[PDB]
């Protein structure tokens, strides 16, 4: 057996991760086009992410090093609202001052005694890389350089505010020295006022004398989200279209997160992009040079486009010259191939108008407080007039920018939409609901006691659905036992006489109840592992408590 060990390591055609459609060269072409577009998008994604990261550090350094005329000595306070432990800061290498970054996590601050010791330990380690306040006092006489300390409180909301409040007062004594300067960085997840309730008002007055306030959230006025979404519009080049349904799904799943919406947006867009090229065969015709790849199945799929049905029925109901209809009915000369080529030739000014409205709002009207996704969906639906009427200045230019989208035939083959729920089951699962349904509707998973005896966990969940909040374990065991087909169980058991212990146990008169109890014990342990139940074993194994219910 190998599972006893906590952890262990095991060591070991050129499969391009795509797979055939319609039950060789086409797959490679599709993969290459997909990868080209995918890398083109991720180039902009990484560029924008790096720009975002580079943006904050300039302001952070400016706040840290903007010397201000003050004769009195006090902490330099910076409030990073909406921040997180993932941020980083680098320090200037000044001439006469030695700079040390002192990180302070809540795990490193159980009491003031540990805090001072660890701060001095880090300070000494940095100084020797080139355990009390005497080290600060004697720092210049040791290393000949002035000391500047930056205490980075990585997560304020989890620190015991009593210990921090006392430690700030402890550091307050350090200002007796002329060669020491201190700066404090606060990382706050909630609003600023959450700190004001927990710290004592003496410490707040110390902090308030020299403090700066900064928001570092990614949701700052839709700026970066709009930029990323417009970059996605750019990187497609009109080679693929986004339906109203998919934009609706994005709008529905974006608002539930409020810190890292950009990451979720990028995840959803990337997943849709990778799904499209694996699903649709016509993604090959993003490159029209391969026009000779048209085949029977492509023609069938084109015939399956509802727009084709609308066009053909419009011709028929008008009693148009029957030769054109017979040409497709008899499938002769396939002029529909050139028809589809001309369809590919078509241009979509929808993207251009969507870009230009945003550019006009930003540059001509200076209206930056808007969502680009809402604008795009309003353009898709055509209610753009009301959306622009949300703002007072957009009347004349709203009338000018009025745009009307027009569909094209076989556009369904070049549109991404949420139509089968695959995009929801994979990123936003109904985890607990799925488990409940699979326990109750196990035929949704599984394809002669096998044919009757349902899985033990589902059978036990049957009783779990109805019973009381606190369950007498004996009653639950009785209820589980009553479901057993004893004779069919004996027939199942007697198929393996090769094991003597099997017959020895089974032929015992107590065997039915013993097997029922063993299965009950295993199922109850599994339920405890899943969080379904909890024993009262601290009192007795006579009662068990339910910890989950259906539907909620």
């Amino acid at each position: 057996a190998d599972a006893q060990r906590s952890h262990y390591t095991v060591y070991p055609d050129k499969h391009i991760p795509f797979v055939k459609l319609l039950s060789e060269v086409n797959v490679e072409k599709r993969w290459e086009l997909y990868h080209q577009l995918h890398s083109h998008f991720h180039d902009q994604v990484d560029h924008i992410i790096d720009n975002i990261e580079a943006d904050l550090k300039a302001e952070i350094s400016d706040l840290l090093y903007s010397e201000t005329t003050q004769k009195r000595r006090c902490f330099n306070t910076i409030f990073l609202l909406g921040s997180d432990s993932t941020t980083k800061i680098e320090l200037k290498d000044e001439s006469s001052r030695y700079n040390v970054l002192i990180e302070l996590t809540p795990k490193e601050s159980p009491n003031v005694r540990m805090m001072l010791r660890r701060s001095m330990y880090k300070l000494y380690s940095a100084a020797d890389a080139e355990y009390d306040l005497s080290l600060v006092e004697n720092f210049k006489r040791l290393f000949g350089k002035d000391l500047a300390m930056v205490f980075n409180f990585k997560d304020v909301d989890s620190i015991n505010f009593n210990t921090l409040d006392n430690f700030i007062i402890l550091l307050k004594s350090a200002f007796k020295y002329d060669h020491v300067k201190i700066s404090l960085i606060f990382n706050i997840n909630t609003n600023l006022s959450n700190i004001e309730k927990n710290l004592r008002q003496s410490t707040i007055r110390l902090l308030k004398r020299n403090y700066h306030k900064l928001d570092v959230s990614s949701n700052k006025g839709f700026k970066y989200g709009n930029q990323i979404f417009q970059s996605f519009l750019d990187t497609v080049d009109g080679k693929l279209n986004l339906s109203d349904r998919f934009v609706e799904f994005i709008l529905s799943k974006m608002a539930n997160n409020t810190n890292h919406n950009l990451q979720l947006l990028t995840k959803m867009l990337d997943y849709s992009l990778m799904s499209y090229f694996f699903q649709n065969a016509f993604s090959v015709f993003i490159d029209p040079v391969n026009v000779d790849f048209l085949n029977d199945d492509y023609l069938k799929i084109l015939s399956r486009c509802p727009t084709f049905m609308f066009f053909v029925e419009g011709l028929i109901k008008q009693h148009a010259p029957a030769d054109e209809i017979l040409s497709l009915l008899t499938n002769k000369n396939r002029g529909l191939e050139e028809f589809f080529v001309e369809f590919l030739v078509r241009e979509n000014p929808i993207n251009g108008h969507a870009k230009f409205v945003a550019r006009f709002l930003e540059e001509e009207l200076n209206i930056t407080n808007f969502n680009l996704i809402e604008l795009y969906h309003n353009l898709l639906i055509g209610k753009l007039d009301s959306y622009l009427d949300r703002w007072s200045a957009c009347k004349e230019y709203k009338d000018r920018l009025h745009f009307e989208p027009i569909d094209t035939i076989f556009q369904e083959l070049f549109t991404l939409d949420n139509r089968s729920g695959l995009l929801t089951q994979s990123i936003f699962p109904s985890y607990k609901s799925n488990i409940e349904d699979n326990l109750l509707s196990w035929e949704q998973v599984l394809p002669d006691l096998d044919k009757i005896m349902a899985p033990v966990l589902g059978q036990l969940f049957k009783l779990y659905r109805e019973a009381n909040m606190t369950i007498n374990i004996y009653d639950f065991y009785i209820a589980f036992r009553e479901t057993l087909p004893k004779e069919e169980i004996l027939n199942f058991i007697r198929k393996d006489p090769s094991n003597t212990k099997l017959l020895e146990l089974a032929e015992t008169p107590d065997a039915f109840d013993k097997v029922a109890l063993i299965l009950f014990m295993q199922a109850i342990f599994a339920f405890e592992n899943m969080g379904l139940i909890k024993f009262q074993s601290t009192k007795s194994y006579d009662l068990v408590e339910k910890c989950v219910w259906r539907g909620i």
């Binding site: 009491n111 005694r113 015991n160 009593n162 309730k197 927990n198 004592r200 008002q201 003496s202």
Partner: protein, 89 residues
């Protein structure tokens, strides 16, 4: 009880926090089960290791008990004080 005229501040709950902090330090109040100064170093060690709930729960919900009973206040508080009339129930 002051009649209204035909055509005293209730201080804000945030400002009262400083007054509460002042009174908690001057030992007029005390936490529900505050042992206070421990007797020996080992007791201080076990006390500093443990984290009391009273230091974690919000400033507005910490339970306190009183050191000067209202009767003592009525003995001490001058009758010329405006709030003296409330030294009775």
């Amino acid at each position: 009880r002051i009649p209204t005229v035909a055509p005293i501040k209730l201080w804000l709950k945030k400002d009262v926090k400083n007054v509460w902090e002042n009174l908690v330090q001057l030992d007029f109040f005390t936490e529900k089960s505050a042992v206070g100064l421990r007797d020996n170093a080992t007791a201080a060690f076990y006390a500093s290791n443990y984290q009391f709930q009273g230091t974690m729960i919000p400033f507005d919900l910490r339970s306190y008990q009183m050191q000067i009973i209202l009767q003592e206040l009525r003995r001490i508080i001058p009758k010329s004080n405006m709030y003296y009339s409330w030294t009775q129930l």
